[PDB]
Amino acid sequence: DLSQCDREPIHLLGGIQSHGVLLAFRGPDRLLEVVSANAQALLGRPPETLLGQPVGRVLPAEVLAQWEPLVARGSVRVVLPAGAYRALLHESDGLTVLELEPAELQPDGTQALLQTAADTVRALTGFDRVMVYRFDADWHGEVLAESKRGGMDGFLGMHFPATDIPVQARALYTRNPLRLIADARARPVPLLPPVVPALGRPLDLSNSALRSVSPVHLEYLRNMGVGASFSLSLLKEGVLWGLIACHHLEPLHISHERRRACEVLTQLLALQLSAEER
Amino acid sequence: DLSQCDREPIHLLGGIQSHGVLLAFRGPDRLLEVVSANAQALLGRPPETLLGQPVGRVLPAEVLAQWEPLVARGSVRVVLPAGAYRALLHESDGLTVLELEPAELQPGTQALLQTAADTVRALTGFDRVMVYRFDADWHGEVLAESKRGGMDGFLGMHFPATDIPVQARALYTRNPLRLIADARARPVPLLPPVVPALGRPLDLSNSALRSVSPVHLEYLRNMGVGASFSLSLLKEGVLWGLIACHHLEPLHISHERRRACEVLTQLLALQLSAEER
Amino acid sequence: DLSQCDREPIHLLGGIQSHGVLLAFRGPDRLLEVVSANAQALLGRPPETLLGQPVGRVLPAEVLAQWEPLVARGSVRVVLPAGAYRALLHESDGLTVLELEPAELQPDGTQALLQTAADTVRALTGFDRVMVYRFDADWHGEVLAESKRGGMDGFLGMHFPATDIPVQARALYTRNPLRLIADARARPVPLLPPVVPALGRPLDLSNSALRSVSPVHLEYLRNMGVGASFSLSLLKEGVLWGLIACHHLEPLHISHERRRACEVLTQLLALQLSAEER
Amino acid sequence: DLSQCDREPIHLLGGIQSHGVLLAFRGPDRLLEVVSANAQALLGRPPETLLGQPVGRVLPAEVLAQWEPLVARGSVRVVLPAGAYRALLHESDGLTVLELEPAELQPGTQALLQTAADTVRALTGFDRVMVYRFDADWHGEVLAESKRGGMDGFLGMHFPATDIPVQARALYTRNPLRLIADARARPVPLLPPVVPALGRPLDLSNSALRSVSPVHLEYLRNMGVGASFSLSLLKEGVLWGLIACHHLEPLHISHERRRACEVLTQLLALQLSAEER
Ligand SMILES: *C/C=C1/C(=C/C2=NC(=C\c3[nH]c(/C=C4\NC(=O)C(C=C)=C4C)c(C)c3CCC(=O)O)/C(CCC(=O)O)=C2C)NC(=O)[C@H]1C
Ligand SMILES: *C/C=C1/C(=C/C2=NC(=C\c3[nH]c(/C=C4\NC(=O)C(C=C)=C4C)c(C)c3CCC(=O)O)/C(CCC(=O)O)=C2C)NC(=O)[C@H]1C
Ligand SMILES: *C/C=C1/C(=C/C2=NC(=C\c3[nH]c(/C=C4\NC(=O)C(C=C)=C4C)c(C)c3CCC(=O)O)/C(CCC(=O)O)=C2C)NC(=O)[C@H]1C
Ligand SMILES: *C/C=C1/C(=C/C2=NC(=C\c3[nH]c(/C=C4\NC(=O)C(C=C)=C4C)c(C)c3CCC(=O)O)/C(CCC(=O)O)=C2C)NC(=O)[C@H]1C
């Protein structure tokens, strides 16, 4: 292994991916306590200025409009002057975290089972390459199926993720079905303040959609020429069983409809993997 | 996974330990969706009856009294006709989960972990306290021991090697304190067996009363262990080790000394990291 | 104040507590220059006889055995015919001071932080009462937390040590983390000779474990019915910040393991008090 | 404490005054653990290089020559190629600390303190000498003054009241003599910034070269003070007062007259106590 990074607190890196914006706030006043340093391009004020403020005079008016279904359902589509956005709400460290990400406009045998899953996910995402790993007893990911376009750069990248995926990464994969790295060549954006005063550490990004990625893994994607990477967790009876990894040589937006279909497919596959016995 | 029992979804077992009571509810009406089957002795109605009801007409009034700091602080002590209780609130699967547990009434590196072992044994009063440090294969190595004179579980410095599954280590990372009040007690099922909105049992990752894997409960019984109380040692937010306390019978620890136990794990986490930078 | 005693040279009283024995010696011959008047019960010769002698024919053979780790580490446990003892070595006035004290046998918010410290120390010592003082800008100790057994003689002794703890006492508390008065009803033992010839004054007992206590404070403990008193200095960034005072109505040996855990706790607390800013 | 600067750990500032050099080492190998950053001009190697080395191959040979009386007497004069030096040895934090400072070459109660003031001004040659007596609130009261004709720091009988912090008075109690050679000079940092074995800087309570609190150094500069030389007046081992000498520029005092200064403080301590018993 590489113990120097297999103890990496990947939930505490204090950064997001640059295509979105993250805000966090506590209390009934809804006072901003965390804000990504890139937030001015979307919110019209400098981040150090927005700290301390209630969200009512911080969020764009289009978001505050949909605030009720946003709390109810945890997500809502909104149309900002900057374009279409997805808003996503979850709870963490006692803070309510708000993530804004660009969206399209809305105006007017077991190997055989996993092979069809591979082909199905590649059809839904359009990504060049899709790989399905199954974890063995040593938690090595075994390449079990591949779907790919004809004539490929990333050849047969059938190498196992061996003494590989650290426990903290597998724990996040268990708690989140979908993980998107929009562009491995893009730069992470730091969260402000660097440590949350109430916590003595950075905000926990375990369930954050925009969570920046361990540099060691981002470098592994870049060496492969991978731009976008989109991953689906395969659970069996609530336990991590495998991983579907989609790699595309450049950014390629997937869109919410086909992302949601991807997650439903992981739920359908979990049923099929468990019910095969009982 | 890591064998016949290391694939166990220990967060989804659907039970609590029998010394406490758990309720869960969604929505602004606060409609009961989850209830432990033992709840009648504390709430005065059958659980199958309390399902569907708002909490305002479900919880005892002493609890609803302190409901503001209970939501505010996440915990509050209350005095019920049955005696003193701790109420504990967290969110899970979109439900807000309330746990009621009885309480008393209210009117070098090896050397550092050696003192930690002696400090925890004095705070808990438990017969034996062990400090494990996890190596690179996530095997726990016994690094310090504090224990009373003349022991039944004498010198247990046998390592937990191909042992503590990832799901257990993940919960040790997310919760600083874990208490098994009595390994001879029986788990109490949560009702309904699967949450209708979820298709599975309520996720008990952050539950104080979460029941115990039958295989580990059986291993505790074989040792003559009654109570088991664990403190997670984190370094820079990553699981580093475990302080495991074993007692031959039940022994209440009490909130003051639990809270002192948790502060010590925070103090120790500073010392393990700041030792470098 | 009481200026008649707030200039008391409490480091120069020339006495020890009666439960231990103190020896001091200079030079490469290691010639006894200071000896407590109670030393015969442990060493088998009269103190005036042991003066001038090298330690090789003065110390018990069990102590001279462990002399190497005693110098190396500053402390060592030894088993004498009289029972188990702790030996403690430090330097003072150019003399090397040796203190022997009985030991058990070894054969086969900020207020919330200080409240847990109070409860933790009471658990480690077993003393009836534990009080935590924090010093304000006038160096008054403010009672900030209390841990105590149910149903108490020393009620709520929440009175501040006000125009109180003299500067010389606070200086010794800064230089020593742990201070034990084994029994406030016991009698101090004089050091011989009454003044050290080389110095023109008594041996400086600033860092002595057995140092006898100012009579005015010993009388204050007795009036409270206090037998044992065990104190821990709280430092922040090397400066005296507060004091944890343990009082027990009778003698109660604490034992080295739990004393050492007590001192580590004061070091851990000092980190938490300083790092809270930087 | 006693304000924004009266909590200052003046024994832990991690610097020395730039006119001298400090080394510290532990163990029987005499391994360098502390070294002032200015040490190369005197020892001929970079400080970061000398760390880890035994002193026998670190100190100049003239110093190791006199090493027996240096350990014996605690001080010895040596003649280096750079000129005459004083070597000074004491123990602190388990380290033995060696300080090198340049030296010249060697081939009623008010009335008593008035003569003491005139005696110290003649011994030091400094422009102004003040005698403070501490009252019961540990405020220093000006009790006698000796000074040259026509003064810049004319008649400074303003009291140091809510002033001299406890940490400064504790060091005045433990050291009879304190010299600030030049308040316009710059402190030299000790390397490494914290002692690895200690988690903090070396304790400089008994160091001759110990640097000065920035706030007090700035107050000296505002007065046009270059050199400052202090004598502690003890009565029965307790701090009683201070003789403070101020000079508008650096002025070496020389060991003979420093030693005479210290003997006078001992003679005065006899007279202040024996006046009763
Ligand atoms: C230092 C820790 C390591 C590590 C971290 C890591 N891997 C993740 C997902 C993942 N990694 C791989 C394969 C590799 N990643 C590497 O860095 C290397 C070698 C240098 C390899 C061979 C795979 C196949 C996967 C599954 C996802 C995929 O694209 O296939 C993650 C989580 C990333 C995230 O989404 O946040 C982390 C943190 N991987 C290691 O091998 C070691 C070096
Ligand atoms: C089937 C899975 C296994 C398993 C589950 C498990 N262990 C936990 C804590 C823990 N276990 C041990 C040691 C053992 N437990 C066993 O069942 C056996 C062998 C039969 C051994 C040797 C230790 C030392 C620890 C640390 C805690 C302690 O008391 O010392 C837990 C979490 C329990 C909880 O709090 O919920 C689980 C789920 N342990 C395994 O070894 C395999 C069998
Ligand atoms: C004449 C000097 C005084 C003095 C000396 C003193 N106090 C010490 C510790 C300590 N004292 C108190 C409280 C009191 N001590 C008293 O004598 C009186 C009044 C008569 C009071 C109110 C406290 C709270 C503490 C902290 C320790 C504790 O048990 O709480 C010491 C050092 C003793 C030692 O360990 O050597 C000295 C020398 N205290 C004064 O108030 C004045 C009278
Ligand atoms: C922030 C802490 C303070 C402080 C520290 C201090 N004083 C020392 C000796 C000393 N100071 C004074 C008078 C002053 N020093 C000041 O900074 C100020 C105001 C800005 C005043 C009025 C005197 C008279 C003395 C006695 C020595 C002398 O030269 O007269 C020392 C020790 C210096 C040393 O040798 O290391 C310290 C650390 N003094 C304070 O008044 C407050 C501000």
Residue numbers in the entry:
A (entry chain A), C (entry chain A): 9 to 116, 137 to 306
B (entry chain B), D (entry chain B): 9 to 115, 137 to 306
What text comes from the article?
In addition, we demonstrate how crystals of a severely truncated fragment of SaBphP2 can be obtained from which an x-ray structure with a very unusual chromophore configuration is determined. The overall structure of the fragment differs from those of the CBD of SaBphP1 and the CBD part of the SaBphP2 PCM. The asymmetric unit harbors a dimer (dimer-NCS) where the subunits are related by non-crystallographic symmetry (NCS) [Fig. 5(a)]. Subunits in the dimer-NCS interact much differently than in the CBDs of the other constructs. A dimer of dimers (dimer-SYM) is formed through crystallographic symmetry [Fig. 5(b)]. However, the angle between the interface helices is about 90° rather than around 35° as observed for the other constructs mentioned. The interfaces of both the dimer-NCS and the dimer-SYM are very different from those normally observed in CBD and PCMs of BphPs. The most notable difference to all other phytochromes, however, is the structure of the BV chromophore. Rather being in a stretched-out (all-Z) syn–syn–anti configuration, the BV assumes a curved all-Z, all-syn configuration [Fig. 6(a)], which has never been observed so far. However, BV cannot close to heme again, as this requires a reduction reaction. Consequently, ring-D is stacked on top of ring A, and the BV forms a spiral staircase [with the pyrrole rings as four steps, Fig. 6(a)] in both subunits. Nevertheless, the fragmentation results in an interesting chromophore configuration and large amino acid displacements that were never seen before in phytochromes and that could even be transiently occupied at some stage in the photocycle.
